Design a protein around this ligand. Structure first.
Ligand SMILES: [Cl-]
Ligand SMILES: [Cl-]
Lengths: 225, 226
């Protein structure tokens, strides 16, 4: 209503964790298609999450990441799909965190916010990435779409966060770099803040943002209690 | 695929209609980003259709096409987005048919099949494209997502086709170039045939295809009746 925020709920893949880094770290082994491969990998991973939910054929996020990567490597006819695939999936398992993630989650946790992740990622892949990047120690809760077998932006995933954290939608500040996820969270009723790193155009305008910043570290002035 | 089939149900955008022609015909006006622009427009159009159904914020396919193009034009920071938008939307309204589309639908209609389209596209945009390409005369029925306000691959849209056409799922041969649409249709229970023109890798393998061909013309030996 007037002084309401109790919880900062973060997206993982694209917001706290850098999805470009799995291919970036291996770009020389991939060759000059690396950027195109990386974009195709990401678009199919997300496509599969959406279409499989619509058609009621769920599989977990690691499996979709794998299928999307296989499809992308095949599309680009790469040499040594197999060794390349192993390296790229290992890099994905421990996806690099954005440089300001750890510090800004610490700062929010110290201001006394419930600090949580809400992610499409299943526990195994998510916990592996959060452990490697040290983000797991600065979280109250990490909530997985794999508990529901239903992906974002179905409202039941945002409802899961509310129910687990014991908060109402208007007591949540929902932070994401993914416009579709901000669209679903905003429609659902979270207060949404976009991390817009590259000044990408607006989308999903029927669910306006509360705020937009260009880095995680700009969340702290904004959310300082 | 044994013929106790009563209906051939076709995807429109990507299968009968060439989604690439809207930018290709205006590539000089767009400049060197034309292909990357074309790919983003298409990807976001489809993204919008999936995510809006998942979050219960339907809008029609023309609106999504417009929003996706506006987004793609801004992403590429294009000069004269206003003029380009008008040109590209007009081109989309009358997308080119693939070369074998009209003739193959006529052969199928001659063999006594119900020949129908089942499309995400709303009637206004789809009818314009169908008329411009003379595909109108080779069709029994044109079914739209806009009737139910629910996009593919949600099973209710495939069920809508069964309902309107008076057929069971297993009496349908469902034809598409879009792997997600074949996945949805196949899981629903239609007999699925992929048009894979460029030999793209397989996807959605939990819903196997009945057949794959590289051209709509190849549907003729697959479906011709005694
Ligand atoms: Cl970025
Ligand atoms: Cl093609």
């Amino acid at each position: 209503l007037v002084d309401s925020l109790r919880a900062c709920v973060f997206d993982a893949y694209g917001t706290l964790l850098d999805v470009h880094s799995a291919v970036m770290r291996n770009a020389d082994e991939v060759g000059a298609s690396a950027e195109a491969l990386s974009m195709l990998w990401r678009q199919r991973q997300l496509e599969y999450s959406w279409t499989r939910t619509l058609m009621h054929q769920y599989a977990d996020f690691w499996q979709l990441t794998d299928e999307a990567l296989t499809f992308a490597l095949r599309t680009y006819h790469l040499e040594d799909r197999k060794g390349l695939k192993d390296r790229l999936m290992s890099a994905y398992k421990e996806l690099s965190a954005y440089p300001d993630a750890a510090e800004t989650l610490e700062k929010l946790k110290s201001a006394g916010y419930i600090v949580a992740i809400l992610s499409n990622g299943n526990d195994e892949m998510l916990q592996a990435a959060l452990k490697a990047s040290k983000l797991d120690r600065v979280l109250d809760s990490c909530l997985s779409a794999d508990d529901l077998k239903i992906y974002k932006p179905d409202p039941r995933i945002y409802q899961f966060a509310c129910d687990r954290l014991g908060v109402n939608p208007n007591e949540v500040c929902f932070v994401s770099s993914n416009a579709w996820d901000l669209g679903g969270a905003g429609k659902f009723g979270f207060n949404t803040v976009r991390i817009n790193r590259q000044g990408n155009p607006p989308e999903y305008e029927f669910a306006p943002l509360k705020h937009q910043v260009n880095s995680l570290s700009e969340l702290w002035p904004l959310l300082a209690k």
